[PDB]
Write a protein that binds this ligand. Structure first.
Ligand code: NA
Lengths: 11, 58
């Protein structure tokens, strides 16, 4: 599901 | 509590996500399911998912 994907790194 | 602000710019890499710039405001619509939250952009009115590490509460 779309909610539980890994987060992107912070810039 | 439900009004958040972007801390950084973000470009969507899926059709389901929102792109936004730093300082843009959002209303959160569902943060219950995981670390990507459903939100509505207060600049465009578009709804989609945003990464919760990119936003903070106003
Ligand atoms: Na956050």
């Amino acid at each position: 599901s779309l909610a539980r994907r890994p987060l992107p790194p912070l810039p | 509590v439900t009004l958040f602000v972007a801390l950084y710019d973000y470009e969507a890499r899926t059709e389901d996500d929102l792109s936004f710039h730093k300082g843009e405001k959002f209303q959160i619509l569902n943060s219950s399911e995981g670390d990507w939250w459903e939100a509505r952009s207060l600049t465009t009115g578009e709804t989609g998912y945003i990464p919760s590490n990119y936003v903070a509460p106003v």
